[PDB]
Design a protein around this ligand. Structure first.
Ligand SMILES: OCc1ccccc1O[C@@H]1O[C@H](CO)[C@@H](O)[C@H](O)[C@H]1O
Lengths: 270, 239, 128, 341, 57
């Protein structure tokens, strides 16, 4: 890779990351204003705030890392891998809950167990949202213990466990996200055709906007998980060479997700 | 102060029982769609509530029926024990999921009064977020009145001649073009009132009622279901 | 006290023109949407025309569209309705019904049997 | 004939107006010009009462100044203990649509009513622990807008039939009827001495009725629109009304004339609920703009603003001792407000 | 003659309304001010009661 190409990629990633930081700052500012106003915020803003702060910490963790690495200067107060993984997991969960929300409030299935579960989720929403941070802590144990073990070793045997362990961390939130998303697209899609005869054009327009937008939400995150999965697997690549090459590609995605979300927040329109 | 502690504990137990009963009541309540029948005396609104009561299980102030369609609960109420002053007791129906506005499309003399009533219901401050299921009724008598009898619609609405049947008319196979023109004209008058203001907040669902009762129940059910779809999608933000 | 005293009205040959003027006292005229409603003999109260708070929104019933023109003079606190090309179906008692609440666009209790914000009306007899 | 009676009525109206003008010498605004202003009072919400599934349409405090009763459109009458924010009784209602709510001075009864046109009186101190419908007063030909207990056995109810009624609960009939209002009677306030009571209707008029005699003594007309709220002055010689016209007005019974008109250019929403403070110095008014305003009853100054409700403020009542003001709104919530020294 | 009877009842009510004693507005203002000032000490909303004697605190 040409040095000029690498510097161009790092410029791209820096611009992307600055825009991400500004966007998350804007969302947290408007939602904090709403908090100070009445503290009246619907479940969807509950997770948006979480993802705004999660996206923000990660975003930062990223910057501490990249120059801590590519540049290599300040190679100490820079190795913030664990907090990045924690915030990302937080992130992979919160969006699943986000997605699971959507699958419960706009559901037409009337199964008695399904209705019971739907109200069980809707009733204890802050408690579940709280749980993600917790199950987030429960899930980084191995990596926390794993990374401590590797640091002790420094100062594939046992590492193989890290190498597969990192995945287990984020597969389950993504499994829930994928399941709930496909459920809502189906349900959304079954509903589409099934009410087409009713000539309800506003219903057609409303149902088309969200279905397409899930398809944007489903797409963008998924690509990023695969970005995170390839980063874990770590072969086909050479960050140190690439580095910024991925950096651009991975956060450029994260740019999509955030904007998608950014506009998606309802109370920001208000 | 052992007695005070005992009294406080008893109060807490009673409060817990009240909250449990309230949660069960909310279970029953939020799963029930409360529809408000609104219309004139000529319109078969009472006929509609009677037919919906006789079709399902069912249940002088307010005529209230409770029924189940596809395991979905509905609570339809007609306010018939009041006076003409409705600017104060209509405020009780600002949380209603849908207002079934039944119109007598056969009678043209009071069709303008029906349009005025629909306009006032649509532009209320307390009914801005309430969607209206329009229930153009007595369609058979409209067909009989426009097939012959020379009862022209242009005397009461002098825009009928300057009106063409919409391309999306999807009429019944045996409908005379004249009856399709008339029914539409009425539907589009109400729809013009609807889309004049408050299009985003709430929507009107025209329906050519006086068909088989099952069709009326099915249309009310589908209209209620979207209405809930719009509300939940606004709440979620996927709008 | 709220008063809406109508004026005008009389025996008019068909095709003639009248101008009913309702003088309003006791309330701020500008803040209230107003509406001319008529009651024909052996019939109920029927809404004829309405004027918004300034004049931006003016509406008429179909039976009188083009014939009648309704205006509001806020400075004099009066409401006029001009009848042109009268027809014998217009013989009625005309009342200036004020909308119950200020600063709104929905008028409910107008044309009700007993409304507190309308006047006694004037009798218009379009006959020869 | 009818013309002669109409002219005679107009002449009497003119004579009453002339007499009222003759009594008008110095306005209450000029009289209270030199008094020290009330100041900027601030009330914080000590207790938010939750549990209603629908909009609160009415509430009323008990004489104990601790227990209140609130009516919600879901068909629920909840008695709240403010001191401990606990629900004592949650009475299910036969008719979901309830617009009035009363608590008896003795605390042994509550009353509710609404679009069912029926005053349901519920006994609280029953032999068992279940609150049951003690009596269903019927006879009104319109929706029941306000209920106010008098002496545990007689109740005054204002309805949409343009008439009010004094009912004997034991017998269940109309002991007295009060006729004369042209529009819907919406608000009802009893005098502290129980002899008289003032009713505000939708004819832009407030009428003072004699309970034991059953005729209207005084008619007050200063509002441009329908009156929604009415509240007797603690003295008993004045009362304040709020209208959909974005004004409250203070009327005196001994002058037959309005004294002051609390209004502002910024306020466009109508007034729903009105109540005075313990001393009558503060007039608390609930509005459609999701807000409440505390006016100086002698100066027409907005002493304070109570802002905690996401929906229309439907009711607000000041306790008997003046300790706190409880405001119930359409957001399914009641908030108790009090001031801190 | 139903309208005549209603008008007669309205006229009778107006007559009962007119011939009553009406105190001057000045005296009404003075009495309202006196009542407001006398009970200003006992108004907990006008003069906020301390926290110790406030049940809602
Ligand atoms: O090796 C640590 C790690 C494990 C699992 C997921 C991310 C990880 O590390 C992250 O990888 C990203 C790849 O684009 C980088 O952008 C981040 O800066 C880095 O912290």
């Amino acid at each position: 890779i040409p040095i000029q190409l690498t510097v161009f990629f790092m410029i791209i990633y820096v611009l992307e990351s600055l825009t991400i930081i500004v966007q998350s700052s804007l969302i947290v500012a408007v939602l904090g204003r709403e908090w100070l106003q009445v503290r009246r915020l619907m479940p969807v803003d509950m997770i948006l705030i979480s993802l705004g702060i999660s996206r923000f910490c990660l975003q930062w963790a990223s910057m501490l890392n990249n120059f801590c690495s590519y540049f290599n200067l300040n190679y100490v107060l820079c190795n913030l891998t664990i907090t990045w993984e924690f915030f990302n997991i937080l992130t992979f969960w919160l969006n699943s809950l986000l997605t699971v929300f959507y699958c419960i409030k706009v559901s037409s299935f009337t199964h008695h167990i399904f209705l019971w579960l739907r109200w069980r989720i809707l009733r204890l929403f802050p408690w579940i949202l709280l749980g993600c941070l917790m199950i987030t802590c429960v899930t980084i144990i191995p990596s926390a213990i794993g990374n401590y073990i590797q640091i002790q070793l420094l100062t594939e045997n046992f590492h193989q466990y890290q190498f597969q362990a990192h995945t287990v961390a984020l597969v389950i939130p993504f499994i829930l996200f994928l399941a709930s998303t496909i459920f809502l697209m189906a349900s959304l899609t079954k509903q589409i055709q099934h009410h087409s005869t009713g000539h309800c054009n506003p219903s057609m327009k409303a149902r088309f906007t969200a279905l397409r937008s899930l398809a944007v939400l489903f797409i963008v995150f998924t690509s990023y998980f695969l970005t995170i999965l390839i980063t874990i697997i770590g072969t086909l690549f050479d960050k140190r060479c690439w580095l910024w090459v991925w950096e651009a590609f991975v956060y450029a995605f994260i740019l999509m997700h955030s904007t998608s979300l950014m506009l998606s927040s309802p109370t920001l329109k208000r | 102060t052992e007695d005070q502690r005992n009294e406080e504990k008893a109060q807490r137990e009673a409060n817990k029982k009240i909250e449990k009963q309230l949660q069960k009541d909310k279970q029953v309540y939020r799963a029930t769609h409360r529809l408000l029948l609104l219309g004139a005396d000529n319109s078969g609104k009472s006929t509609i509530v009677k037919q919906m009561r006789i079709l399902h299980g069912g249940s002088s102030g307010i005529f209230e029926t409770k029924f189940q369609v596809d395991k979905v609960n509905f609570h339809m109420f007609d306010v018939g024990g009041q006076r003409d002053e409705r600017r104060k007791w209509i405020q009780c129906f600002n949380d209603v999921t849908a207002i079934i506005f039944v119109v007598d499309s056969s009678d043209y003399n009071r069709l303008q009064e029906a349009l005025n009533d629909f306009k006032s219901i649509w532009n209320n401050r307390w009914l801005r977020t309430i969607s209206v299921i329009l229930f153009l009724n007595k369609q058979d008598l409209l067909a009989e009145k426009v097939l012959a009898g020379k009862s022209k619609i242009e005397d009461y609405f002098p825009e009928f001649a300057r009106y063409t049947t919409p391309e999306d008319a999807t009429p019944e196979p045996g409908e005379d073009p004249r009856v399709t023109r008339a029914k539409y004209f009425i539907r589009d008058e109400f729809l013009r009132i609807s889309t004049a203001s408050g299009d985003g907040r709430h929507y009107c669902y025209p329906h050519f009622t006086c068909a088989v009762d099952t069709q009326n129940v099915k249309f009310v059910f589908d209209a209620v279901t979207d209405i809930i779809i719009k509300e939940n999608l606004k709440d979620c933000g996927l709008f | 006290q709220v008063q809406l005293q109508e004026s005008g009205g009389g025996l008019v040959q068909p095709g003639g023109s009248l101008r009913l003027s309702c003088a309003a006292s006791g309330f701020t005229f500008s803040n209230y949407k107003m509406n001319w409603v008529r009651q024909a003999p052996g019939k109920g109260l029927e809404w004829v025309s309405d004027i918004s708070q300034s004049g931006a929104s003016i509406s008429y019933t179909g039976s009188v569209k083009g014939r009648f023109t309704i205006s509001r003079d806020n400075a004099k606190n009066t409401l006029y309705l001009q009848m042109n090309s009268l027809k014998p179906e217009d013989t009625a008692v005309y009342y200036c019904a004020r909308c119950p609440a200020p600063f709104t666009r929905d008028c409910f209790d107008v044309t009700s049997t007993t409304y507190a914000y309308r006047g006694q009306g004037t009798q218009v007899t379009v006959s020869s | 004939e009818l013309d002669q009676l109409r002219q005679e009525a107009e002449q009497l109206k003119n004579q009453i107006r002339d007499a009222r003008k003759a009594c008008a010498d110095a306005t209450l605004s000029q009289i209270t010009n030199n008094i020290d202003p009330v100041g900027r009072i601030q009330m914080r919400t000590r207790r938010t009462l939750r549990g209603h599934l629908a909009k609160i349409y009415a509430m009323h405090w008990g004489t104990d100044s601790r227990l209140l009763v609130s009516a919600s459109q879901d068909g629920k009458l909840i008695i709240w203990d403010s001191y401990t924010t606990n629900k004592v009784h949650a009475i299910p209602l036969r008719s979901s649509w309830v617009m009035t709510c009363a608590y008896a001075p003795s605390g042994n009864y509550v009353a509710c009513g609404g679009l069912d046109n029926i005053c349901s009186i519920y006994n609280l101190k029953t032999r068992e622990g279940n609150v049951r419908v003690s009596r269903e007063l019927a006879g009104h030909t319109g929706y029941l807008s306000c209920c106010r207990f008098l002496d545990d056995n007689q109740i005054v109810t204002s309805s949409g039939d343009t008439t009010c009624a004094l009912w004997d609960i034991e017998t269940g009939q109309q002991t007295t009827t009060f006729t004369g209002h042209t529009g819907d009677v919406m608000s009802l306030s009893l005098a502290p001495d129980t002899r008289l009571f003032v009713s505000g209707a939708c004819d832009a008029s407030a009428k003072l009725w004699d309970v034991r005699e059953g005729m209207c003594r005084q008619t007050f007309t200063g509002h441009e629109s329908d009156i929604n709220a009415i509240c007797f002055f603690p003295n008993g010689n004045a009362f304040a009304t709020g209208s959909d016209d974005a004004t409250c007005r203070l009327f005196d019974l001994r002058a037959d004339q309005e004294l002051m008109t609390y209004s502002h250019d910024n306020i466009i929403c109508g007034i729903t609920s009105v109540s005075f403070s313990k001393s009558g110095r503060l007039l608390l008014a609930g509005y459609d703009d999701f807000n409440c305003n505390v006016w100086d009853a002698l100066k027409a100054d907005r002493a304070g603003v109570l802002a905690g409700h996401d929906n229309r403020v439907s009711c607000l009542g000041v306790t008997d001792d003046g300790m706190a003001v409880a405001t119930g709104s359409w957001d399914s919530f009641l908030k108790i407000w009090n001031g801190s020294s | 003659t139903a309208s005549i009877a209603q008008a007669r009842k309205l006229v009778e009510q107006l007559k009962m309304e007119a011939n009553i004693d009406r105190i001057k507005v000045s005296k009404a203002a003075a009495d309202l001010m006196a009542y407001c000032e006398a009970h200003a000490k006992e108004d907990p909303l006008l003069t906020p009661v301390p926290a110790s004697e406030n049940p809602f605190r």
